[PDB]
Automatic annotation (TrEMBL):
The chain holds residues 447 to 646 of 1099 of the full protein. Residues 26-102, 108-197 form the BIG2 domain. It comes from the Bacteria. It comes from Geobacillus stearothermophilus ATCC 12980. This is Surface layer protein.
Length: 200
């Protein structure tokens, strides 16, 4: 025979990004949730005919040359273990092929992005800005958010969605009395401060 394709897949999509947690991503960075994670393989004969009706596991077997890093079932099924690089192998009699596979470290919170630099609200009014959590790769990250205010007699604060389960939240600040103060937005071990000025 001859090995004509060796791709990593889930639900017919090629996998460009794979985390330690098993999550997988196409070219666009849209997550694949359908299918199981596998390697696909196609083969030709000595005259270039695509060998058909072939059984993965029986006619051909898959090996992981780095089994502490990535588990590959002989039928081609795939589960990541920790971040690193694994070399994967397909076998068809004497005929073999090798591809690299990269497991990336899972997302963790890197940045609390804040739509605002300071807030100006009139006494007895509300103001609004957005908070976006980002991971080390600079994509949206779902995580918890907590907002407080240094002086509640000047201004009070609240967050959409009870500050859980989301990667984008709305912060409302109510103007309570004339004067100034600071809101603090906390998430994980990180924190941003925002000044606030309540006008008449």
């Amino acid at each position: 025979a001859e090995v004509s394709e060796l791709k990593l897949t889930k639900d017919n999509k090629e996998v460009v990004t794979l985390y330690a947690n098993g999550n997988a991503f196409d070219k666009d960075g849209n997550q694949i949730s359908s299918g199981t994670l596998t390697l696909t393989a196609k083969f030709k004969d000595q005259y270039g005919n695509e060998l058909t009706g072939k059984v993965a596991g029986t006619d051909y077997t898959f090996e992981s040359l780095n089994p502490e890093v990535l588990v590959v079932a002989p039928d081609g099924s795939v589960t990541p273990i920790v971040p690193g690089t694994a070399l994967v192998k397909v076998k068809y009699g004497e005929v073999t092929k090798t591809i690299p596979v990269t497991v990336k470290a899972n997302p963790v919170l890197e940045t609390i992005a804040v739509d605002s630099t300071g807030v100006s609200v009139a006494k007895g009014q509300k103001a609004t800005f957005k908070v976006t959590l980002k991971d080390q790769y600079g994509n949206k990250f779902t995580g918890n958010v907590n907002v407080t205010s240094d002086k509640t007699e000047t201004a009070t604060v609240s967050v959409s969605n009870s500050g859980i389960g989301q990667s984008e939240y709305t912060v409302t600040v109510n103007g309570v009395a004339e004067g100034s103060t600071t809101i603090t937005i906390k998430s994980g071990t990180k924190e941003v401060k925002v000044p606030v000025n309540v006008v008449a």
